[PDB]
Design a binder for these strands. Sequence first.
DNA 1: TTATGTTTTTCTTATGTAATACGTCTGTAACTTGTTCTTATGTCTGTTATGTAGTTAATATAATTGAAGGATTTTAAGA
DNA 2: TCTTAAAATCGAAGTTAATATAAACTACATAACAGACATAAGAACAAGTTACAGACGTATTACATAAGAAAAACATAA
Length: 70
Amino acid sequence: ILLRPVDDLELTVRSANCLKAEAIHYIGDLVQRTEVELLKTPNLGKKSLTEIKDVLASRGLSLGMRLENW
DNA sequence: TTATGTTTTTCTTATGTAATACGTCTGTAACTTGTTCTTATGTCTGTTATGTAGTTAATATAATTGAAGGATTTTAAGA
DNA sequence: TCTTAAAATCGAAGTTAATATAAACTACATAACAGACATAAGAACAAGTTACAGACGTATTACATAAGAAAAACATAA
């Protein structure tokens, strides 16, 4: 699922309002958005990164995706 | 030959130095809760349309409506 | 027992889409329409509370290194 807006991720209000500021609107950014850079962002800890990765894993996706052109 | 002052060395402690681990403060969010303004609606009331009941005094005094090349068979009523 | 009147029936589908003449007035009660008001339902704004997350700040732990103190050895004088 690389064709959905991030708001369709069923993300909680905290994660949605955080990731909205980083101009991250499609999963294609997030699948290669590195774990470290995701952790550096304001208001995003390990226990929320866990749920982000869990929602990704439910729909096949995950972080750490070497990828292709746009 | 031996006692003693000295100097260097090693052990001991002290301030800093850092690493990882874990608690506090604070910033956002879920959950309610009170207050005020707005709105659709149910209900009351006045006015007009309408639907019903009644009355009318030359005299007048036993329908109508078609219906029209039907044959064949069965079964009740008359005699 | 013989006429004689009634009674009943007469293939399927398919199609096959209206007619169409002919008293007045008055009084009264009832239903319907329109306007306005109050009520129940609804929406928006702000506030309290209860908790969890996030990254910072505290305490536990293991030390590096340099200053200070004790001691052993050495050289010297009586």
